[PDB]
Every structure is written in C-alpha cells, then in structure tokens.
Amino acid sequence: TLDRVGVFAATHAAVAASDPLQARALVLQLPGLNRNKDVPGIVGLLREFLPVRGLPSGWGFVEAAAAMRDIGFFLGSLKRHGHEPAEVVPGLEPVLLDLARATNLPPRETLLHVTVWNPTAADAQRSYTGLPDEAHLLESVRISMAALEAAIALTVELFDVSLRSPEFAQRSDELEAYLQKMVESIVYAYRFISPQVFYDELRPFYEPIRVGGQSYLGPGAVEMPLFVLEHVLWGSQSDDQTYREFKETYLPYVLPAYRAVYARFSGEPALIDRALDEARAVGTRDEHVRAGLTALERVFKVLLRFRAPHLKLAERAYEVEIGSGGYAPSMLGELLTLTYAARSRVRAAL
Ligand code: HEM
Ligand SMILES: N[C@@H](Cc1c[nH]c2ccccc12)C(=O)O
Numbered sequence: 324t325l326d327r328v329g330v331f332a333a334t335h336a337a338v339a340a341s342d343p344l345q346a347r348a349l350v351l352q353l354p355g356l357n358r359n360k361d362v363p364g365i366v367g368l369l370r371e372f373l374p375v376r377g378l379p380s381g382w383g384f385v386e387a388a389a390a391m392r393d394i395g396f397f398l399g400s401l402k403r404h405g406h407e408p409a410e411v412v413p414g415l416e417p418v419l420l421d422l423a424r425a426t427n428l429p430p431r432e433t434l435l436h437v438t439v440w441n442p443t444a445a446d447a448q449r450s451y452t453g454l455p456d457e458a459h460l461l462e463s464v465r466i467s468m469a470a471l472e473a474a475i476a477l478t479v480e481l482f483d484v485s486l487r488s489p490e491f492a493q494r495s496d497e498l499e500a501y502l503q504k505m506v507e508s509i510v511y512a513y514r515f516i517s518p519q520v521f522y523d524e525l526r527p528f529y530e531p532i533r534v535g536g537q538s539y540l541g542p543g544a545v546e547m548p549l550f551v552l553e554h555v556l557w558g559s560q561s562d563d564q565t566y567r568e569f570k571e572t573y574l575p576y577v578l579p580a581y582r583a584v585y586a587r588f589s590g591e592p593a594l595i596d597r598a599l600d601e602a603r604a605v606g607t608r609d610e611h612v613r614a615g616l617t618a619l620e621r622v623f624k625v626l627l628r629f630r631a632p633h634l635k636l637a638e639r640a641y642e643v644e645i646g647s648g649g650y651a652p653s654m655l656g657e658l659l660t661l662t663y664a665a666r667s668r669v670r671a672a673l
C-alpha cells in the first residue's frame with residue numbers, strides 16, 4: 324500500500340549499515356559503563372575509536388553520519404553524568420565540527436543518528452542505556468520516519484494540485500494514509516514504554532551540550548520533520564510567534580532538504596489557504612472541490628489523532644521540567660489548539 328516508504332528506508336539503511344570507525348563492539352560496552360556511572364571509563368572507551376588525525380579523506384555523507392552516530396552516544400552519556408563532553412575529551416570538539424561540516428547537520432547526535440541511522444540487530448544497535456524501554460522508544464520512531472518523509476513529498480506535490488481536479492482528493496487520501504504511521508507510533512509508545520522508566524532512566528540522557536560557543540539540543544522525536552510538513556500544509560503564514568519560534572528551533576536538526584522545503588514556503592500562503600481561497604472562488608457545487616475538502620479534513624483528523632494522544636503520553640511522563648526539545652508539555656497544548664483551528668477552517672468551508 325505505502326509504496327513510497329521504500330526509497331526513504333533504503334537511504335537510512337545505508338547509514339545504519341556503515342561502521343567507518345569499526346566501533347560496533349565498542350559502543351555495545353557503553354550501557355554497562357553508564358549503569359556504573361564510570362565517567363573515566365566512558366571517556367577511555369570513546370578514545371579507543373575517536374579519530375585523532377582528522378577524518379579519512381574518502382568519507383562521504385554516509386561515513387561521516389555514521390561516525391557522528393557512534394561518537395554521539397558518548398555525548399549524551401557524558402552530559403548525563405554532569406559533564407560537557409568537549410571539556411573532558413580533548414580533541415573532541417574539532418572532530419564534531421568536521422562531522423557537522425561533512426553532513427551539513429549539527430555537531431552532535433540527532434534523532435536521525437540514534438533511530439533510523441542506527442542498526443537494529445541486538446549485536447549492533449547502539450543505545451545509551453541498553454534498556455528495553457529505550458529499544459521500544461527507538462522503534463516508535465522507526466515506525467513512522469520514512470512514512471513521514473513520504474508524506475512531506477506528497478504535501479509538496481499536493482500544493483501544486485488544483486482543488487478542481489479529482490487528483491486533489493486522491494493525493495489527500497494518499498497523504499492521510501502515510502500520516503497514519505504517526506498515530507501508530509504513539510499507540511506503540513503508549514503500549515510499550517513505561518513513563519516511569521522514561522523519565523527516570525532515559526530523559527537524563529537527552530540534555531543539551533555546548534559545542535562551538537552554543538548549545539545544541541539532545542535527540543528527541545520533536546526533531547522529526549512533521550513541523551516542516553505542517554508549515555507547508557497550514558502554518559507557513561501563521562502570525563503566532565510562539566509557533567514560529569517552535570518551528571525555527573528544530574530547523575537545524577532536520578535534513579538539509581527539509582530546511583530548503585521550509586524556506587521555500589515561508590511567508591507565502593499555506594496549502595490550505597490556497598485550497599480554501601480556490602473553494603471560495605469556485606463554489607462547493609463543484610464535485611471535486613467537495614471531495615477535495617472532505618479528503619483534506621481527513622488529513623487534519625489524522626494529525627489530531629497523533630497530536631492529542633501524544634499530549635497525554637507526554638503529560639503522563641512528566642507526571643513523574645521540559646523535554647529534550649526545551650519545551651514544557653503546555654506548548655503541546657498550544658500546537659493542538661492551532662491544529663483544531665486549522666481543521667475548523669476546513670470543515671467550515673463544507
Ligand atoms: C515517552 C515518550 C514521549 C514523550 C515523554 C514525549 C514528550 C514530548 C515533549 C515534552 C515534547 C515538547 C518538545 C520537547 O521539549 O522535547 C514533544 C514534542 C513532539 N513529539 Fe514527543 N514525546 C514522546 C514520544 C514521541 C513519539 C513516539 C513521537 C513520534 C514518533 C513524538 C513526536 C513528537 C513531535 C512530532 C513533537 C513536536 C510537537 C507536535 O508535533 O505536536 N514524541 N514530545
Ligand atoms: N523529547 C521528549 C521525548 C524524547 C526524548 N528523547 C527521545 C528520543 C526519541 C523519541 C522521543 C524522545 C522528552 O525529552 O521528554
């Protein structure tokens with residue numbers, strides 16, 4: 324059914340299969356050291372594979388991304404024990420900045436590095452803690468990432484489709500089907516991840532670190548480019564400053580291509596503004612307009628089926644303080660309000 328996922332999953336698998344620093348067996352030793360809070364041992368382990376002579380000249384994006392992944396788990400870990408990794412590992416910060424340059428991404432690990440770029444096998448998967456709850460957490464993101472990327476592409480495609488065309492209803496139906504994966508992610512997370520273990524044992528690994536005279540956020544599903552999708556779909560012309568700050572916050576953490584998608588659509592009418600202006604000019608007596616708007620309403624419905632239970636998941640965890648993305652769960656309530664208002668505009672048009 325979801326025939327567009329494959330190419331995205333294949334691009335991730337290429338980084339997941341890469342071990343350019345031959346660090347697999349070394350990184351597996353990291354959970355035990357974290358459990359023991361052995362900060363010197365964590366540093367010594369990292370130094371067994373950290374490049375000291377600069378990056379190998381034949382590396383491409385894949386090798387540099389994979390190297391950032393493997394060094395990256397040591398970054399969150401060190402900070403978890405109360406230490407800036409750059410301050411306790413000499414020669415580390417230049418390597419992190421060279422990897423940022425090679426990948427056009429920040430100089431630490433992101434969500435991409437620790438989930439879809441991270442091999443899945445028990446004898447290869449990297450992890451801060453080695454806990455089952457961390458494994459399910461990574462899996463919850465693997466469920467929807469590739470499908471979300473397909474959904475961004477469909478949203479961009481749909482933006483150039485006329486509401487008068489039968490293609491509009493068909494593309495929106497397809498979009499809705501990919502976005503359903505976000506719902507499946509939250510259902511999985513609610514079923515398999517203990518909020519207690521998350522807050523007490525996992526959350527401490529996602530604090531910010533200082534590199535290059537600024538602060539970089541730790542990994543979190545908040546870095547998934549859903550905000551880019553919705554910037555295009557409904558939020559590009561929003562005048563809510565809190566919302567605009569939220570989106571701009573995560574922009575550095577998404578793939579370069581999605582920063583460029585975001586830039587392309589900023590300060591211009593969102594898909595739904597255009598769709599709704601078209602509906603107003605042409606009338607809902609046009610059968611394709613009616614079907615298009617109905618299909619579009621189902622897209623917002625699925626966004627809400629993600630967002631509302633995600634808010635409960637988040638509050639239940641903070642029922643045991645802000646996320647790794649730097650927000651309290653109250654900002655989640657604000658984004659939900661905006662999403663309901665966007666859906667309401669669509670349903671009022673019908
Ligand atoms: C126990 C698991 C989770 C907790 C406690 C949690 C909590 C949070 C928090 C506190 C935020 C605000 C940003 C921050 O400060 O980090 C956030 C944002 C966000 N999270 Fe989660 N989250 C969890 C799992 C997930 C999962 C599994 C997904 C999807 C695969 C997800 C997707 C998002 C998205 C897309 C945002 C941006 C806000 C939005 O789109 O509504 N989260 N989450
Ligand atoms: N950002 C949320 C949840 C989170 C942290 N790290 C993650 C990694 C993957 C998925 C979700 C998360 C928090 O800090 O509470």
Ligand SMILES: [C-]#N
Pocket residue numbers: 543544545546646647648
């Ligand atoms: C959700 N981070």
